[PDB]
Amino acid sequence: PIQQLLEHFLRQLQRKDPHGFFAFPVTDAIAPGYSMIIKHPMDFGTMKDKIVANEYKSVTEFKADFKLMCDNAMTYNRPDTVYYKLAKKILHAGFKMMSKERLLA
Amino acid sequence: PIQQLLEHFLRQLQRKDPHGFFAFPVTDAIAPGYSMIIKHPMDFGTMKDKIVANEYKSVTEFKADFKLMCDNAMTYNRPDTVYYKLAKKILHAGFKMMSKERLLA
Ligand SMILES: COc1cc(-c2cc(C(C)=O)n3ccccc23)cc(OC)c1Cn1ccnc1
Ligand SMILES: COc1cc(-c2cc(C(C)=O)n3ccccc23)cc(OC)c1Cn1ccnc1
Incomplete structure (x- = not known):
């Protein structure tokens, strides 16, 4: 179904994260105090399961x-860090990848 | 290409480092002050080139x-850290892999 299309998109993004910083929680x-500051944690690991259970x-x-x-x-993370810089890159990339126009392919 | 037993050993170790912390310098x-503390840096990236040029x-x-x-x-790194703990794992692994007795094979 549309599950297949999400797995295409997911594998495009996982490849943009070669060191797997977004791979599990x-x-x-x-990450000291991560659980206190981020109350809605998310990762490709979690997004994989939610395609396996068609929850999208x-x-x-x-x-x-x-x-x-x-x-x-x-x-x-501070702007100075690897995790921040990769987040902004992947965010802007995925938004152009899964956009209104490119969805028409 | 007689020395490809190094490439066997290398790819055994690279696989033990899935996030690729030892993949380039x-x-x-x-790593603040890394250059001041470590004057002899080494990485799989550097060790790959030294097999490409048969310098071993x-x-x-x-x-x-x-x-x-x-x-x-x-x-x-402090003992508490992921880079330290992965280093000691890979160290104890490679020492049993490339040992006195197993070198007979
Ligand atoms: C997904 O697994 C990992 C994630 C991160 C990591 C990811 C992030 C992010 C996404 O904020 N982060 C923030 C501060 C400190 C570390 C991290 C850092 C990692 O190693 C430095 C690892 C890999 N890991 C986790 C436990 N053992 C290896
Ligand atoms: C090979 O690439 C990386 C190496 C390390 C890393 C490796 C080490 C080691 C092995 O000492 N280290 C020590 C302190 C802080 C970081 C590191 C940490 C990394 O990301 C958190 C990365 C990945 N990286 C570097 C630049 N962009 C991604």
Whole structure:
């Protein structure tokens, strides 16, 4: 169904994150106080399961989570950091990838 | 190409580092003061080129670089950190992989 289209989009984005910083949830162990600051955590790992269980109706629900993942990254980490810089790149990239016009292909 | 047992050893270790923390040089941007503390930096990226140019004579030359990479990691980073813990895992793994007895094969 539309699950297949999301898996195409997901694999496009996972490839843009070669070091897998967005691969499973961030822990307080590696990110002090992450759980207190980000109350809506999101990751490709979580977005994979939600395609496996067809819990995505629209594209717009998928990109909502995708944006939440990048906003979390740009909210917890300083602009100086690898996690911030990669978040902004991936956010702007995915939005042009899953856009109104490019969806017509 | 007689020396490809190094490439066997290398790809065993690279796979133990899925996030690719040992894949190219650490920068002071990512690691404050790295250049001051570690004067002999080493990485799989550097070790790949040195197989491409067959600059490794013995196994013991390869393990020497391998050890330097892990000892750098266990010198610069605190025990608490993911880079330290992965260094000690890879160190104990490579030592059993490239050991006195297993070198018979
Ligand atoms: C998805 O797995 C990881 C994520 C991050 C990571 C990701 C992020 C983000 C997305 O904010 N982050 C923020 C501060 C500190 C670390 C991180 C950093 C990581 O290693 C430095 C890893 C890989 N990891 C986790 C546990 N062992 C390895
Ligand atoms: C090979 O690329 C990386 C290496 C490390 C990393 C590796 C190490 C080591 C092994 O000491 N290290 C020590 C302190 C802080 C970071 C690191 C951490 C990384 O991201 C958090 C990255 C990935 N990276 C670098 C620039 N863009 C992505």
